[PDB]
Swiss-Prot record:
One of its GO terms (cellular component) is nucleus. GO terms for biological process: anatomical structure formation involved in morphogenesis; BMP signaling pathway; cell differentiation; cell population proliferation; embryonic limb morphogenesis; embryonic skeletal system development; endochondral ossification; epithelial cell differentiation. It comes from Homo sapiens. Belongs to the distal-less homeobox family. This is Homeobox protein DLX-5. One of its GO terms (molecular function) is DNA-binding transcription activator activity, RNA polymerase II-specific. Phosphorylated. Phosphorylation by CaMK2 increases its protein stability. Interacts with XRCC6 (Ku70). Keywords: Activator, Deafness, Developmental protein, Disease variant, DNA-binding, Homeobox, Nucleus, Osteogenesis, Phosphoprotein, Transcription, Transcription regulation. Transmembrane segments: none annotated. Residues 1-59 bind DNA. It is found in: Nucleus. Transcriptional factor involved in bone development. Acts as an immediate early BMP-responsive transcriptional activator essential for osteoblast differentiation. Stimulates ALPL promoter activity in a RUNX2-independent manner during osteoblast differentiation. Stimulates SP7 promoter activity during osteoblast differentiation. Promotes cell proliferation by up-regulating MYC promoter activity. Involved as a positive regulator of both chondrogenesis and chondrocyte hypertrophy in the endochondral skeleton. Binds to the homeodomain-response element of the ALPL and SP7 promoter. The chain holds residues 138 to 198 of 289 of the full protein. It is linked to Split-hand/foot malformation 1 with sensorineural hearing loss, autosomal recessive: A disease characterized by the association of split-hand/foot malformation with deafness. Split-hand/foot malformation is a limb malformation involving the central rays of the autopod and presenting with syndactyly, median clefts of the hands and feet, and aplasia and/or hypoplasia of the phalanges, metacarpals, and metatarsals. Some patients have been found to have intellectual disability, ectodermal and craniofacial findings, and orofacial clefting.
Length: 61
DNA sequence: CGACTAATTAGTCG
DNA sequence: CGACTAATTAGTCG
């Protein structure tokens, strides 16, 4: 397996700020966001999956 | 095709 | 240890 990414406080703040406004990203958005943070689109896509899952599990807790 | 999901697996750190 | 969460799996979706 791929080693676990360690997000810097800057990348996490940015992802969290974006998620407040955009829960699902369009492809061009995902590309722009990932490039802005020095990440791959896969790392961004997986962060959004996991963040959506965090919210859903709270909803069903 | 490649988005999504729930479930799972496994690393981080208070 | 345990909440958290990054990465993987095995499906669905029109």
């Amino acid at each position: 397996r791929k080693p676990r990414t360690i997000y810097s406080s800057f990348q996490l703040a940015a992802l969290q700020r974006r998620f407040q406004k955009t829960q699902y990203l369009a492809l061009p958005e995902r590309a722009e966001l990932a490039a802005s943070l020095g990440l791959t689109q896969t790392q961004v896509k997986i962060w959004f999956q996991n963040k959506r899952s965090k919210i859903k599990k709270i909803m069903k807790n």
